[PDB]
Ligand binder design. Structure first.
Ligand SMILES: Nc1nc2c(c(CN[C@H]3C=C[C@H](O)[C@@H]3O)cn2[C@@H]2O[C@H](COP(=O)(O)O)[C@@H](O)[C@H]2O)c(=O)[nH]1
Ligand code: SF4
Ligand SMILES: [Cl-]
Ligand SMILES: [Zn+2]
Length: 160
């Protein structure tokens, strides 16, 4: 079983075209202010209820945001912070692998994410699952499903 960090609903939609049995982990203290975190969270919840996904919602609090701010090249930091928490959760909950929907994400740097994931794997002993999540047309498939579900598609990465 694989625990997949979720950044946003559009990238979750792309991802679920190809992953069959996952637990998802919405953890993003980088997203501010609270109204934007909640907007993104509610869109993920809408996708999860539509497709009966198993999503867990991580901590979002003043403290959690301070931990992230202390951590943040800055995107390398940010992504490593999110995936470290994910791999910690994967070990706690007995998942032998972890991944992230950031791999679906058209803007992001696939080599940098795979490098971070492999480094975190070596630290925690949870296998990092890499996939070209946009491949298989899945990306345009995620767009079509976003439109259909009327899913919030954001306009910036999340942080201030
Ligand atoms: N620089 C940049 N511009 C981006 C995007 C996005 C997609 N959001 C991604 C970014 C973070 C999220 O987590 C998503 O992955 C849209 N835009 C631009 O905003 C306008 C949207 O018009 P209105 O309907 O809000 C339009 O000019 C569109 O081209 C992006 O990523 N970067
Ligand atoms: S742009 Fe995105 S990846 Fe880079 S620091 Fe901000 S939230 Fe993190
Ligand atoms: Cl994103
Ligand atoms: Zn995303």
């Amino acid at each position: 079983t694989v625990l997949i960090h979720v950044c946003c609903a559009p990238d979750l939609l792309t991802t679920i075209f190809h992953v069959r049995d996952a637990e998802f982990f919405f953890y993003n203290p980088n997203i501010q202010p609270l109204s934007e975190y909640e907007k993104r969270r509610e869109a993920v919840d809408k996708v999860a209820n539509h497709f009966s996904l198993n999503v867990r919602y991580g901590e979002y609090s003043t403290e959690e945001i301070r931990k992230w701010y202390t951590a943040v090249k800055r995107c390398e930091r940010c992504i490593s912070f999110l995936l470290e928490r994910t791999a910690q959760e994967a070990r706690k909950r007995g998942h032998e692998s972890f991944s992230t929907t950031l791999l679906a994400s058209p803007r992001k740097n696939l080599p940098m994410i795979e490098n971070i994931g492999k480094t975190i794997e070596e630290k925690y002993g949870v296998k990092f699952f890499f996939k070209n999540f946009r491949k298989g047309g899945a990306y345009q498939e995620g767009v079509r499903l976003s439109k259909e579900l009327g899913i919030y598609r954001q306009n910036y990465c999340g942080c201030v």
